[PDB]
Design a protein around this ligand. Structure first.
Ligand SMILES: Oc1cc2ccccc2cc1O
Length: 222
């Protein structure tokens, strides 16, 4: 398949990304608590449902939530301010809460079943969100870094296989602050560092110019 792109909602961020986040790729956004990673996830879950003329892929979404941070009311707001019907937008987001890192890994295998079911339809899965990808692994493997890296590596390999096999954009978040970070090392297709700037602006930079945007009723925008 050709590489599809999903607009982030921000022209600035889209330019930095070459048009938007790519299908057949894992995009990892990392930064401190409160930097806006989950807001970007919510925005992408709406944008992907637009037609290509508006920066979407007419796509369905699957969302694995590890921190109980998914907010349907926020999806509704973004959808209503992106000219979409909020009920339709929510009906095309499949949502699951991961109880722990092992359940998170099983949910990726489960996601493949729904991906296959929708593959030949007019609303194939085009976006798989894992927010947060690392939080359970970090808490469960304190003092056991080598084992943590083994499990994360298999999890990321599973996500890669889905991205490439089914032409999906995988978008993952990773909280990194004071003294923290192996990030996801070199595993993601693309690493985006997100931070707060003056006056509530958010700033994004590719790791391996900078885009600037705001969090608004449209999700994010210039
Ligand atoms: O109904 C489902 C929703 C999911 C969401 C994320 C990952 C896997 C899922 C599997 C489901 O059957």
């Amino acid at each position: 398949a050709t590489i599809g792109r999903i607009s982030t909602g921000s022209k600035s961020l889209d330019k930095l990304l070459g048009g938007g986040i790519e299908t057949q790729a894992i995009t990892e956004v990392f930064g401190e608590f409160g930097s806006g990673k989950t807001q970007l996830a919510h925005t992408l879950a709406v944008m992907v449902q637009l037609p290509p003329e508006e920066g979407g892929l007419n796509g369905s979404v699957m969302w694995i939530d590890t921190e109980n941070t998914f907010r349907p009311e926020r999806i509704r707001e973004i959808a209503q301010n992106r000219g979409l019907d909020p009920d339709e937008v929510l009906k095309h987001i499949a949502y699951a809460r991961a109880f722990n890192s092992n359940h998170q890994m099983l949910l990726v295998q489960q996601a493949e079943d729904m991906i296959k079911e929708l593959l030949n339809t007019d609303r194939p899965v085009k976006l798989l969100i894992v927010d947060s990808l690392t939080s359970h692994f970090r808490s469960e493997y304190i003092g056991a870094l080598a084992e943590r890296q083994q499990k994360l590596a298999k999890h990321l390999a599973d996500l890669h296989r889905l991205a490439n096999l089914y032409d999906i954009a995988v978008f993952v978040t990773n909280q990194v602050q004071a003294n923290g970070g192996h990030i996801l090392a070199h595993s993601a297709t693309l690493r985006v560092y997100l931070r707060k700037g003056k006056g509530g602006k958010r700033i994004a930079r590719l790791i391996d110019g900078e885009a600037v945007f705001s969090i608004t009723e449209k999700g994010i925008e210039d």
